[PDB]
Every structure is written in structure tokens, then in C-alpha cells.
Amino acid sequence: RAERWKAENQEGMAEVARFIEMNGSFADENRDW
């Protein structure tokens, strides 16, 4: 079931990571440590 979740989503998660790389991470903008 976990492999089914990873598989269905591998493309989408890669897409989000590229989006964050291009757009800038909100987390990086705000981390205070």
C-alpha cells in the first residue's frame, strides 16, 4: 500500500519539488534556526 502511494505520486512529488526550487521555499524564507 505504501509503494502504491509512492508510485501514484512520484511524478507529482517531483513536480512540486521543481516548483519549490523555482518559486522559492516558504520554509527557507522563514526558518529562524
Partner: protein, 101 residues
């Protein structure tokens, strides 16, 4: 306040976020929030369970759950919307990120 949407007062490609921290958890000067990205920017291959789509007025937004962050109160602008009606989806998204689900 949990599930309220606010303007983000920092120079950024992000302009709005949704507060997702519990109202009983006090962190002076900070709140944990999920930023919104224009929905047109992401394809349907992106999980709606993990990254919910919300509609505010004439705009559609993706909740960028995994890019959540605590922010200084100084960058929390005015309230612009309420997403309390999407509590179940938001809880499901956050719980998926941590606990797989």
C-alpha cells in the same frame, strides 16, 4: 488563528497563507502556516489529498502543505478568508505528511 487565511507581508512569490497551528498552542511571536500557490501552477498529477485545492473568490489556490513554516507575527497581514469548512481535508493533508495516512 487556525484555518484563517492571511496576507503575507514579505517580498515573495507567495502572497497568502493559511494558519494551521492549534489555537491552544501558544508560541509567542510565531505561527505555523501553509502557503498558497496559484492552482494553475500545478498539474493534476499533484495529490489533492496532500496538497488541497481551495477556492477564494475568483482565485483557485493549492495548499503547499510540505512547504509549511512558522512565521514571525511581523509578516502576518490582514485576514482575507476563512477555511474552517475545509478542516477535514486540511487535517487529512497534514496527517498524511507526517503519518502516511
Amino acid at each position: 488563528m487556525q484555518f484563517k487565511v492571511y496576507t503575507y507581508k514579505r517580498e515573495s512569490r507567495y502572497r497568502l497563507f493559511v494558519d494551521v497551528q492549534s489555537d491552544i498552542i501558544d508560541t509567542p511571536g510565531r505561527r505555523m502556516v501553509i502557503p498558497l500557490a496559484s492552482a494553475r501552477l500545478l498539474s493534476d498529477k499533484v495529490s489533492r489529498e496532500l496538497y488541497p485545492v481551495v477556492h477564494i473568490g475568483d482565485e483557485s489556490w493549492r495548499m503547499m502543505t510540505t512547504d509549511m513554516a512558522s512565521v514571525p507575527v511581523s509578516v502576518i497581514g490582514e485576514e482575507v478568508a476563512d477555511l474552517s469548512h475545509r478542516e477535514n481535508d486540511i487535517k487529512n493533508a497534514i496527517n498524511l505528511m507526517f503519518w502516511g495516512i
